[PDB]
Amino acid sequence: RFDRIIEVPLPTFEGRIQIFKIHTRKMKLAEDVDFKELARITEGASGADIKAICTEAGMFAIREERAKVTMLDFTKAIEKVLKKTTPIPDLKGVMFV
Amino acid sequence: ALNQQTLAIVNVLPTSKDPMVYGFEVEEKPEVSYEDIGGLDVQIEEIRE
Amino acid sequence: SDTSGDREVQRTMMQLLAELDGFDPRGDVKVIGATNRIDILDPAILRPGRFDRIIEVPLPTFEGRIQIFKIHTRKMKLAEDVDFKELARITEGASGAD
Amino acid sequence: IRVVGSEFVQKYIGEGARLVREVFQLAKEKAPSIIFIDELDAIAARRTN
Amino acid sequence: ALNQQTLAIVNVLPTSKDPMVYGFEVEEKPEVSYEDIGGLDVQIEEIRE
Amino acid sequence: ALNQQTLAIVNVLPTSKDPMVYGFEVEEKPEVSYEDIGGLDVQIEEIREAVELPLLKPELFAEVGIEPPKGVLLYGPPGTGKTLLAKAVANQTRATFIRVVGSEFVQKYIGEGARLVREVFQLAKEKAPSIIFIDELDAIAARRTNSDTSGDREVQRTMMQLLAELDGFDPRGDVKVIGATNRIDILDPAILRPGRFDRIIEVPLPTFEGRIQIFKIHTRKMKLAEDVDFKELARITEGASGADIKAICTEAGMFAIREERAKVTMLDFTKAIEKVLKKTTPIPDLKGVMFV
Amino acid sequence: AVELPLLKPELFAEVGIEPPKGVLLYGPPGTGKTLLAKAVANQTRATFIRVVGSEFVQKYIGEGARLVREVFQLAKEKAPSIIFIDELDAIAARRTNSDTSGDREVQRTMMQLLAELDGFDPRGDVKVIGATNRIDILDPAILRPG
Amino acid sequence: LRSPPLLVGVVSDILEDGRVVVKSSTGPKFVVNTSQYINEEELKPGARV
Amino acid sequence: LRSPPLLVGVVSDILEDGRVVVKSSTGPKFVVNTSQYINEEELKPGARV
Amino acid sequence: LRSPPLLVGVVSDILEDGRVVVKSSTGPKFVVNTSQYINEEELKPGARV
Numbered sequence A: 001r002f003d004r005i006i007e008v009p010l011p012t013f014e015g016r017i018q019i020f021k022i023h024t025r026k027m028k029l030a031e032d033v034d035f036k037e038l039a040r041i042t043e044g045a046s047g048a049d050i051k052a053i054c055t056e057a058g059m060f061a062i063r064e065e066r067a068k069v070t071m072l073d074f075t076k077a078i079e080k081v082l083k084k085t086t087p088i089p090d091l092k093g094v095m096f097v
Numbered sequence B, E: 001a002l003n004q005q006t007l008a009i010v011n012v013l014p015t016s017k018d019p020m021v022y023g024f025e026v027e028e029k030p031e032v033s034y035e036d037i038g039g040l041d042v043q044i045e046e047i048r049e
Numbered sequence C: 001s002d003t004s005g006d007r008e009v010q011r012t013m014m015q016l017l018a019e020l021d022g023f024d025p026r027g028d029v030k031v032i033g034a035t036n037r038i039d040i041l042d043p044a045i046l047r048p049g050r051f052d053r054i055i056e057v058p059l060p061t062f063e064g065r066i067q068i069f070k071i072h073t074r075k076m077k078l079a080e081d082v083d084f085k086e087l088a089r090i091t092e093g094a095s096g097a098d
Numbered sequence D: 001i002r003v004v005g006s007e008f009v010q011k012y013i014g015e016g017a018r019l020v021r022e023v024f025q026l027a028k029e030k031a032p033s034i035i036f037i038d039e040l041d042a043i044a045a046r047r048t049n
Numbered sequence F: 001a002l003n004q005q006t007l008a009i010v011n012v013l014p015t016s017k018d019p020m021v022y023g024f025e026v027e028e029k030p031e032v033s034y035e036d037i038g039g040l041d042v043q044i045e046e047i048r049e050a051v052e053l054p055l056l057k058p059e060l061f062a063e064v065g066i067e068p069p070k071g072v073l074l075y076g077p078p079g080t081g082k083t084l085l086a087k088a089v090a091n092q093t094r095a096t097f098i099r100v101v102g103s104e105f106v107q108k109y110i111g112e113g114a115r116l117v118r119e120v121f122q123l124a125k126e127k128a129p130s131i132i133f134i135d136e137l138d139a140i141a142a143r144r145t146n147s148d149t150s151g152d153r154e155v156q157r158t159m160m161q162l163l164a165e166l167d168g169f170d171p172r173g174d175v176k177v178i179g180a181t182n183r184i185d186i187l188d189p190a191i192l193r194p195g196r197f198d199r200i201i202e203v204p205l206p207t208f209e210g211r212i213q214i215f216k217i218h219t220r221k222m223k224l225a226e227d228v229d230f231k232e233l234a235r236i237t238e239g240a241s242g243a244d245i246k247a248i249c250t251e252a253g254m255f256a257i258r259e260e261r262a263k264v265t266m267l268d269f270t271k272a273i274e275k276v277l278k279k280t281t282p283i284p285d286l287k288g289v290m291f292v
Numbered sequence G: 001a002v003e004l005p006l007l008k009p010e011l012f013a014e015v016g017i018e019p020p021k022g023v024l025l026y027g028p029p030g031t032g033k034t035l036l037a038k039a040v041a042n043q044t045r046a047t048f049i050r051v052v053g054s055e056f057v058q059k060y061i062g063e064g065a066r067l068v069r070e071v072f073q074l075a076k077e078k079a080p081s082i083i084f085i086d087e088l089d090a091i092a093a094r095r096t097n098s099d100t101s102g103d104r105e106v107q108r109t110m111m112q113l114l115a116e117l118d119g120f121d122p123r124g125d126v127k128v129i130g131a132t133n134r135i136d137i138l139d140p141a142i143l144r145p146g
Numbered sequence H, I, J: 001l002r003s004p005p006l007l008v009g010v011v012s013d014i015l016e017d018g019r020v021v022v023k024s025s026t027g028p029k030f031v032v033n034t035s036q037y038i039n040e041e042e043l044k045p046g047a048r049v
């Protein structure tokens, strides 16, 4: 009844990076946003996670009364989104590595 | 279509109704659209196919 | 599945997900959602893209309790031996309604 | 007014409670009235611990 | 009964025409009596009290 | 007949032939008697005494002292034949058999409808001896809410009209009310009221002796060569219903066509049972290798 | 099961047996219950009546019945003929209790259907071929063969 | 009179008085005669008129 | 008694044009007009009018 | 023209035969004309009128 069954899971390593370019482009210049660095921090997050991070980078911009997004705003916004979402556990096994 | 008070056929109306909020919204434009074509790239290739 | 108080309560949740954003634009909402606990909430509501900022509301701090007190005291007519600091020490671990 | 005990309870309840309220109300309107309540075993059971 | 011209109660008719019971089974002044009970002799007397 | 412009009663009188229900009897007796039905056999006695007898004579039952049934419900697993038994009642009463569905009594507007319920019982009374069979009921034996609004009110009105009527034309036989239900766990009182009924006949899935009689009657119309052991087959098909026993006949015969036989054989029944039995619960394998 | 007694009643008569009254098709979804039904339709050549078992049950009570009564009557006139009812799980689904003006309507339309099949009322040569998505979601009347 | 507009109904019942009981699709039943050249012999219940 | 009947309905919506929409117990919706002593200040949640 | 009584309709669709299909709240659907004060910009499926 379909035939073309598509699983759309969490964005890949390269996949998240691409999403950041499109959004960072709308929000002007940033000569210090390393998209790749953003991925490393965000390892395994949906397409709408990446967009909320983008909203809040704009908000940290205007709380410092900046007219453009720089690396520090993205750091603050990634820090907020990922903390809430849903934090890294700290039991890895005492019988495993 | 039928006559005001004598009722008698005067016209024909299209065969098939009713397009209200069942398909008249043919929206495919921005800002939810192909703003992101940079997925998640592989799945997109499959829909295009 | 196969319930009626915890299957059909979901088929009206599914209409909502889905007129807020979805194929259905935008508008000027910005839906302010409010819930007591998120332990009986679907993860679809919880994730962002709609509900971008997930704002916890804590229990008011020491200074926090004082501010609350005076809001309530302002409407009352008070004595000048009233010391909030001591009262906020005792009432540690309390919400604003208390 | 006879209420049977097979009209008591469902596996999620309200209709069982409603017909009890109804005959009590009706009994109130129609007094002298005798509300027969057979058979306590499906709305009365010891409290499983 | 309301006047069909302009509606106004013009004849008060008897209530519900004629009253209806529910809460089945309903037995007003049951066909079973206290002389219809035998063997359960001292139990007749206890429920009368 | 009313004047729709003077508002005086013009004419009166139910004339009632009455087309709307006329086609519903007589059935000129079905082709299915108690002879054409297998053994039960004690519950056969139960229907004849419950149904046929008070119908010719509330007098003999009165003389005795007893009260005839309020209504009779037939109950059992489907394929015992409940409406099959009803065809049997129809054959020995030698009479009326009112055919209408309980699906047509519940209708979406009003005094179609209500009138229809009263019509079915007026009709019985004049055409009598009768014998109203309606038909496998679950829906006149629904539950009320007060109210979920379109369904309920209709079902609640027709339920009171139904039960009141049967009580009141049978303290004593005059019209026998017969019916059936397939499942009786799915329902909330209506017919499971004991003030409205009192004879519930359990129609059982057939006895060891019952199966043999069913098999027998089925081969009667069919053609066979004598080698068929009817008693043996009945042993295998314990836990089945009577209808299955027909299917096995019919299926044995379809096998016979495939073998090029126009009579049925013992080989054909063993094969037909084997089809049905097998589909339940496993029959071949194994011999090893290790079980040898 | 079907093409043989339509085209040729004779073999069944010679032995003294009766043809089928229907055929039940089930299995897992995608096994070709409906594809096979469009297939058989070319080969019956006997008036293939297509109704869909989900067009039944309305807000109206009794209106569902009306529809079953009408297809079986049409089939008698056309007979031999195929009534293929696509879903036995929407007018033939399994109960628990009456609930109330939805679930209950299912057994109301099902009560109409029994009745006509060959409960009291002559079939001609129909031959209701049913089909269902799941294996079990059937009433005991329909599960029982006959 | 046979000119439009005409309302469709069906015959419900035949009665002993030259008249046929007619249930129109709108609602209400009427007790009315046939015509001269339309008989109650021709008419039948379920006969659309 | 000769004074007229008054059709009950419940206010379907409030429009800002001096009209008010009232769903009539007849079935239809009709759009109706205020007086000079029923104002919007006399309209509340669940207004039977 | 504009003064009461007024009737609720809902544009079910717009027809190009120079009529508009309106669902009356009353019942009957009707195909009807428009004037210069009405725009086709205004008109969409499901527009209250």
Ligand SMILES: Nc1ncnc2c1ncn2[C@@H]1O[C@H](COP(=O)(O)OP(=O)(O)OP(=O)(O)O)[C@@H](O)[C@H]1O
Pocket: F036, F037, F038, F039, F077, F078, F079, F080, F081, F082, F083, F084, F136, F182, F214, F217, F241, F242, F243, F244, F246, G114, G118, G119, G141, G146
């Ligand atoms: N005891 C029997 N003798 C002859 N035929 C029988 C017997 N038992 C079952 N059958 C056959 O099986 C069919 C009868 O079962 P059927 O499923 O029609 O009816 P029912 O018990 O009234 O059920 P339902 O609950 O489906 O309304 C008939 O074709 C009938 O000939």
Ligand SMILES: Nc1ncnc2c1ncn2[C@@H]1O[C@H](COP(=O)(O)OP(=O)(O)OP(=O)(O)O)[C@@H](O)[C@H]1O
Pocket: A001, G028, G029, G030, G031, G032, G033, G034, G035, G036, G133
């Ligand atoms: N044996 C077959 N060989 C080839 N393809 C088949 C076969 N049977 C079915 N199909 C294919 O599977 C498709 C889908 O299944 P089909 O349409 O036969 O539905 P169904 O089993 O009645 O399902 P549903 O449960 O969705 O109602 C067909 O359109 C056809 O492509």
Ligand SMILES: [Mg+2]
Pocket: C017, C018, C022, C023
């Ligand atoms: Mg979505």
Ligand SMILES: [Mg+2]
Pocket: F082, F083, F135, F136, F180, G119
């Ligand atoms: Mg039956």
Ligand SMILES: [Mg+2]
Pocket: G033, G034
């Ligand atoms: Mg299918």
